[PDB]
Design a binder for this molecule. Structure first.
Ligand SMILES: C[C@@H]1O[C@@H](CC(=O)O)[C@@H](O)[C@H](O)[C@@H]1O
Ligand SMILES: C[C@@H]1O[C@@H](CC(=O)O)[C@@H](O)[C@H](O)[C@@H]1O
Ligand SMILES: C[C@@H]1O[C@@H](CC(=O)O)[C@@H](O)[C@H](O)[C@@H]1O
Ligand SMILES: *C(=O)C[C@@H]1O[C@@H](C)[C@@H](O)[C@@H](O)[C@@H]1O
Ligand SMILES: [Ca+2]
Ligand SMILES: [Ca+2]
Ligand SMILES: [Ca+2]
Ligand SMILES: [Ca+2]
Ligand SMILES: [Ca+2]
Ligand SMILES: [Ca+2]
Ligand SMILES: [Ca+2]
Ligand SMILES: [Ca+2]
Lengths: 8, 114, 114, 114, 114
């Protein structure tokens, strides 16, 4: 989600 | 030898783009300054772009790529190529199985941008 | 020397992907056996993927990348690099102006796929 | 209601062009007579033309546009417009997220050609 | 009636793309705030992209398309269509002769971008 650091 | 680690010029924007060629879902982690900066994930057997991102190389310039499938890290091959002393490519291939085509996740880092 | 022309193994699928880093609109043409097989157009100064596609090298295996801005051919730089004797990259850089950064249109061809 | 499905005159050449306006990589598939006839892909937030192609509507004239982002289908809006009873546009917009701008992939079909 | 003139939201980025379907060389002028902001020229009988660009609607938002073929003004048809109250198309067709197909230069303006 953001932690992770999921990016497109 | 260590693979998937590149020293870029510090505080420089670069692009990172990952393609998938495997029946297993690819997870690509891009680290800058030894910290996760971007994470891609997707599945394709047709070279689909599972992620593309512009990042900053930070104060150290150290960029590292990791690839894993279902928690299992893939074996990496990598190299850097520079054209006309200006255009830089940092190339990564990865292998998650036994056929050794090393295209299961392909990661291209390019700089400078703009 | 001639730039942007690559001999691939015949009848092989390959990916081709174009990035844009210029204020001018980039037009990227991928020819297979001297016939246009893919066209990407777009303007970006942030490494946008103005196109990615999977093509077949055909019976000739001849692949050519052309880049033009406002109808004027850009100057090209290119090379091929092979990792662990299996993973192939064909790389193309292009310059549309006077800064000589050669990232105005960046094309990456990779094979094998699947 | 169904969106992205258009009945063209049979056996007529038509153009199809895809634009991208999203951080996610767009995948546009064009089906003629329920068979995949073209596939465009790219990532841009600046309206890059990730694909353009001339297709034939075939004996059925049925053309369908599909858009997906890393495997997830986008929600589609569509309509057809005819100017001076001769010039046809088949328009498609798509949303891949939550902001509802419906420009993430924009597909324009136009006919007749030549 | 006046054709090819559209009032966009002020200070809004929009894409403009032109296709050609005529043996005559098409000249497309895109005016913003009554000043020429882009000019495309090219010749195709196969719907080829002769130009694409991102522009800003400016303080007035007034965008005008003009098409000429070797000094001869083309007659224009145009309309604007809004899908799901968000996605905008400004469509222009042009006729340079007598066959009344109005595809000789096709211009598609779309917004918003990003
Ligand atoms: C079908 C295969 O997917 C993997 C194996 C599983 O199955 C990859 O190692 C192969 O290269 C190929 O893409
Ligand atoms: C934005 C600039 O645009 C070009 C030329 C015009 O301006 C490129 O050649 C430059 O290197 C730089 O990207
Ligand atoms: C090829 C032809 O070119 C023109 C005129 C000359 O001839 C166009 O008006 C026609 O629509 C047709 O495309
Ligand atoms: C993901 O970030 C959502 C996405 O990308 C934004 C840049 C904007 O284009 C938005 O519309 C798109 O859905
Ligand atoms: Ca493998
Ligand atoms: Ca593989
Ligand atoms: Ca340059
Ligand atoms: Ca540049
Ligand atoms: Ca959106
Ligand atoms: Ca968008
Ligand atoms: Ca005509
Ligand atoms: Ca015509």
């Amino acid at each position: 989600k953001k932690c992770k650091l999921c990016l497109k | 030898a260590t693979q998937g680690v590149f020293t870029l010029p510090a505080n420089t924007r670069f692009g990172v783009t990952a393609f998938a060629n495997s029946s297993g879902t690819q997870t690509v982690n891009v680290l800058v300054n030894n910290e996760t900066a971007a994470t891609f994930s997707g599945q394709s057997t047709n070279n689909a772009v599972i992620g593309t991102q512009v990042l900053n190389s930070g104060s150290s310039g150290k960029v590292q790529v990791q690839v894993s499938v279902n928690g299992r890290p893939s074996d990496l091959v990598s190299a850097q190529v520079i054209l006309t002393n200006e255009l830089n490519f940092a190339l990564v291939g990865s292998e998650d199985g036994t056929d050794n085509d090393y295209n299961d996740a392909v990661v291209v880092i390019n700089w400078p941008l703009g």
